[PDB]
Amino acid sequence: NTLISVDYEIFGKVQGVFFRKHTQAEGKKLGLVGWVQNTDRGTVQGQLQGPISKVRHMQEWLETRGSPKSHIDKANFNNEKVILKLDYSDFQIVA
């Protein structure tokens, strides 16, 4: 009953706009676990883990919406993989 993990990195106007707060909220709403963090190249990165359909909904959110004041240029997804079990028990803002 298939769980996946995927890494993400979001490019655009994504800092100074409460991106991490909104990402955590949306991930939790979708029953996802993982994490979100700001990077030193100005992007937002993290991992998403959960059922495929929920992860995919979140991937879409990360492509077009993000936080209200944000302007997303590109969401890069990497290392999509099936997992035996969740590696996380919550969705953390790493900060």
Numbering used by the authors: 4 to 98
What does the literature reporting this entry say, word for word?
Here we used a pair of thermophilic/mesophilic acylphosphatases homologues (acylphosphatase from hyperthermophilic archaeon Pyrococcus horikoshii (PhAcP) and human common-type acylphosphatase (HuAcP)) as a model to study how local flexibility of the active site affects the enzymatic activity. Despite remarkable conservation of sequence and structure at the active site, the catalytic activity of the thermophilic PhAcP is significantly poorer as compared with its mesophilic homologue HuAcP at low temperatures.
Secondly, a pseudo-wild-type HuAcP (HuA99) was created by replacing the C-terminal residue with an alanine residue to resemble PhG91A. Importantly, the activation energy (52.5±2.5 kJmol−1) for HuG99 was analogous to that for PhWT (49.1±1.4 kJmol−1), while the activation energy for HuA99 (29.5±1.9 kJmol−1) and HuWT (37.6±3.1 kJmol−1) was comparable to that for PhG91A (32.1±1.7 kJmol−1). On the other hand, the distance was ∼6 Å throughout the simulation of PhG91A and HuA99, suggesting the salt-bridge was broken. In contrast, despite the mtm180° rotamer conformation, transitions to ptt180°, ttp180°, and mtt180° rotamers were prominent in the MD trajectories of PhG91A and HuA99.
